[PDB]
Design a protein around this ligand. Sequence first.
Ligand SMILES: Brc1ccsc1-c1cc[nH]n1
Length: 209
Amino acid sequence: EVETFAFQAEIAQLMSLIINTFYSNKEIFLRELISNSSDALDKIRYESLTDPSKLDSGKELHINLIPNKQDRTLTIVDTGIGMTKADLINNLGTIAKSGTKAFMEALQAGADISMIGQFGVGFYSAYLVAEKVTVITKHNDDEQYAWESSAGGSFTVRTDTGEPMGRGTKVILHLKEDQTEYLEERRIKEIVKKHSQFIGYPITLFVEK
Ligand SMILES: Brc1ccsc1-c1cc[nH]n1
C-alpha cells in the first residue's frame, strides 16, 4: 500500500530551482548527503550514552558509498538514528520550509547553490544529479519505510518489505543519464577527499564487480 503526498509549495519550488538552474558544480551533492549521514550518526551516538539499548539494532556507526553501474545508482548508506514515518511525511518538511525560504532569498541576493547546506536543506541537492531519489530508513521506534520522489511536486511513502536494515538510512540516487561520472571510483574518491575529509565516521567506498 503506497501513499502519495504533495510537497509543500516552498519545497516544490526549491526542487524545481535545483533541477532547472544551470549550475556546473554538481559534485557538492555528495558532501551534503555525507554531512546528513554524519549528523544522524552523531544523534544515535549521543542518545546511546544515556540508553545503551538504542544500539541493540546495531553497534557499528559508519557510512558506505555504493555505486552500481548496471542499475545506474549511487547509494549512500548510514547506520544513524534513522527516520520515523512522521519525519518522512511531516517533520522534515516542516523544518525545511524556513531554510528553503532563507536559501531562496540568499540566492536572489547573490549566494550560490553550493551554500545550500548552510540552510539545512542540503538533501534536496540530490536532484542536481538524480532523476529519482529513494530513501529506505529505519528508526528504533518505527517500522522500515521507503520514501521516493522524482520531483514534480509529489513523493510517496510505503512500508518497506526489502532487506531489513537494522537501523539507519539508505539514500538511493537514480542518476540522470549525463551524470554517470558519480559512479566512477576515482571521481567519488576525489570528491570525498575534497569536501568530506574530516568526517568522524568511517566512509567506505565500495568498488564495482
Ligand atoms: Br535528515 C535525517 C533525520 C533523522 S535521520 C536523517 C538522515 C540520516 C541519514 N541522512 N539523513
